[PDB]
Paper text:
Recombinant YpFabG crystallised in two different crystal forms; YpFabG crystallised in the presence of TMAO (YpFabG TMAO) diffracted to 2.5 Å and contained one monomer in the ASU, with electron density visible for 234 of 244 residues (residues 2–189, and 197–241), and was refined to Rwork/Rfree values of 0.220/0.255. Overall, these secondary structure elements are arranged in a topology of β1-α1-β2-α2-β3—α3—β4-α4-β5-α5-β6—α6-α7-α8-β8. These secondary structure elements are clearly observable in the YpFabG TMAO structure, with only residues 190–197, which form part of the helix-turn-helix motif comprised of helices α6 and α7, and the loop region connecting the two helices, unmodelled due to disorder. Furthermore, the loop joining β-strand β5 and α-helix α5 within the YpFabG NaBr structure is largely disordered, with superposition of NADP+ bound and unbound E. coli FabG structures indicating that Ser138 located at the start of this loop region must move ~3 Å to accommodate the nicotinamide portion of NADP+. The conformation that appears to mimic that of E. coli FabG in complex with NADP+ could possibly be induced by crystal contacts, or the presence of TMAO within a binding pocket that becomes occupied by the 2’-phosphate of NADPH upon co-factor binding. Crystallographic symmetry of YpFabG TMAO arrange to form a tetramer highly similar to that within the ASU of YpFabG NaBr, with superposition of the YpFabG NaBr structure and the tetramer of YpFabG TMAO generated through crystallographic symmetry indicating no clashes that would alter crystal packing.
Ketoacyl-acyl carrier protein reductases (FabG; EC 1.1.1.100) are highly conserved and ubiquitously expressed enzymes of the bacterial type II fatty acid synthesis (FASII) pathway, catalysing the reduction of the acyl carrier protein (ACP) linked β-ketoacyl molecules to β-hydroxyacyl-ACP thioesters necessary for the formation of saturated and unsaturated fatty acids. The refined structures of the two crystal forms of YpFabG reveal that the protein contains a typical Rossmann fold motif, comprised of a seven strand twisted β-sheet surrounded by eight α-helices. The YpFabG tetramer is formed through two types of interfaces.
Numbering used by the authors:
A (entry chain A), B (entry chain A), C (entry chain A), D (entry chain A): 2 to 189, 197 to 242
Write the structure that this text describes.
């Protein structure tokens, strides 16, 4: 259980972020989900209830980060747990990929982790406790065609986490990555099922479970690690 | 919790095996720890209580495996969870390493996993549920000097688990590995602490936590994975 | 030998880039080394001779890339081989790392690879032959403290290369990474020697050898691979 | 070139072992290929010519190893280069896999490497130069269904090599692994071609090239490494 802990889950509107936010709430956490719109933030608040609050965050905007965090520090307190699930895709072959499509993915999926991690670190070091978890992807390891930007960002996240893990290990702060396989998405056959040995798509809840485990005090000695939830895939 | 589950922990006399056995008992499991001697088995029974039983097992002996399992099936029931923590070391440089020292490690740390995994598989497939977890080591990945046999076995275990994971994924059976770092042992300074970023040795309980998580229904979609608990090391 | 091949080595002024450029020239290549200054470009031309030319390139500047490539296409021809050795470091702990220091490393060490790779790809696909090699680092895999940006970029490079490798494999184009260990640098004891088993620092020539091998027709079936030259380290 | 070098290639009768033996001969090596039968040894001698000799070797038999090596030391000299390509398969699901089928693979593909490596090490350390290369497999890393024994052995080989690499790095001896993908075999469609991005099966020559590169003086700083030749696969 996360009694008295404050967890910040970016992109907590639906799917994995929502599952993670809901599961953390269920186990006594003070969760704070984010969206890119006030509407989504309200939608988040609605299902979070009095246990947490939904806020509008733009991971690419430093100002937004500062503002949202200031709100979090003012209303609730210092962030003990950080879940980076904010991410987008701009798929294209190498040819036909605009600088925009590359840079956006880099800014949203990689640089954001640096910014947000950097923003909450001091309080964690001070408090002698911290959890930084980033939802990565299997294609950050495999990777995948038409996703050079995504694979680059998601590999970069692993590198970042492993590099950071060595930096703040002695201070009871762990930095890890969770890599989902083919999870059940809003979008969703044979191509996906054939790849996975388990013969079934993963559930967001299953990812939330992994994150929740890494977030708990039972994973205090696990850091700079990449946990793969893909049902035998890869 | 593991209500109504039967867990077989090999080498459950002290340290990691004991922690794992104790933690599984604590969460409603019917645990069955093993030793190489009847004395150790009794010692295991003593601390397990009415929740489980300590038995004498020789992983290198097929007859012993059959006997012990027959006892387990007769008294308790089919093994739902299998924890392979039986292992030894015969350290030596490549020169100066007897065929005996190599073969013993191979037989005890690698072939045993095949035998025991093979022994309990049918009931798991039939039952449409199974957990096979092997306690590996960081030197199975790094690895380490004067431990070619140990590293070979412990890498082989990972290969085995990953190969098996693909075989029985569709049947709700997962096969994973847990790799401890420098855990607090009966034997136990700067050399070990310097290597680890966390600045502290891991606890058996922390390993037990990881195993217990992999054993639970919250890791149903994690298979063929190697979870490293080393506090930022490696 | 690289008879009739055109190789573009970024950051070919000294050390590894120079070794790579020199070794490629030695084996019949038409090499084209780059620097950030005209002075360095001249310095490159001086030691390359009539076999190649030194040009001024700014990997972060699209205009510069277009210009330099236009020069290369006009004077010599289409790039058959691409060696990405352009890279910098802005070391700092996570706290105390300016957005500038992060972004510069990301732009120079990661986005550059995307741009340059994208720029030369069409001719390679058309020509049904291509070599894209990026000089990475061991800390992109380990990684290292006070180098989150560097590790992120250098992991991202691996992700990128692996993702791209799947994209253009059928067209006889390979995309790989070379990761040096502690190579003899302009800067350069026990700390470095203790980490390396080989008891000695690597030489730029040794890296050049690896790159040259990957560049040759003997590595036509090696793609999306990361070759580590670190003398038993890691 | 390998002028004045003595190379021992196990299982050098056809395919990859033959390619490796032929390519090493071509570049000035004194090669010594092996078979399990005198017929195969003669067949090897026939195509090797006066540059080398074909001998009968049984990797599972210590006596055979001692004898063959004694012959090699008497006739030619100390082994400078060791290529382990001796290997077999006994495919079966976990259930239905006899102890025999497991143990044979372990003895032939894993323990052999230990024995042969151990046998030639002293001369290499003495001579301050050595090359130990083992032909592994992609399924030692992936791995594969119905091949738990093979995957275990081939992962164990990697562990062994990495463990050994740290042991003898300072003495100018390197221990590496080459992992082929779907190479053109005596046996050999869509299933294999679909898996490989390159859209073609690898050639034994391509593997021989990799081994030859690792064997040469241009890979003196590459040790404990696993080079994957699979044309973008994995």
């Amino acid at each position: 259980s996360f009694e008295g802990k404050i967890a910040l889950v970016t992109g907590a509107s639906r799917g994995i972020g929502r599952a993670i936010a809901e599961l953390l709430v269920e186990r006594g956490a003070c969760v704070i989900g984010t969206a890119t719109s006030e509407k989504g933030a309200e939608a988040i608040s609605a299902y979070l209830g009095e246990n947490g609050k939904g806020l509008m965050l733009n991971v690419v905007d430093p100002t937004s980060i500062d503002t949202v965090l200031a709100t979090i520090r003012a209303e609730f307190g210092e962030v003990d747990i950080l879940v980076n699930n904010a991410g987008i895709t701009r798929d294209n072959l190498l040819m036909r990929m605009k600088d925009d499509e590359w840079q956006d993915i880099i800014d949203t999926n990689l640089t954001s982790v640096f910014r947000l991690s950097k923003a909450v670190m001091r309080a964690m070091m001070k408090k002698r406790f911290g959890r930084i978890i980033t939802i990565g992807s299997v294609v950050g390891t495999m990777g995948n065609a038409g996703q050079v930007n995504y694979a680059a960002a998601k590999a970069g996240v692993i590198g970042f986490s492993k590099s950071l893990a060595r930096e703040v290990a002695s201070r009871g702060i762990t930095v890890n990555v969770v890599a989902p396989g083919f999870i059940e998405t809003d979008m969703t056959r044979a191509g996906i099922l054939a790849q996975v040995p388990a013969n079934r798509l993963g559930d967001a809840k299953e990812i939330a479970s992994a994150v929740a485990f890494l977030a708990s005090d039972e994973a205090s000695y696990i850091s700079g690690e990449t946990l793969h939830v893909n049902g035998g895939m890869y």
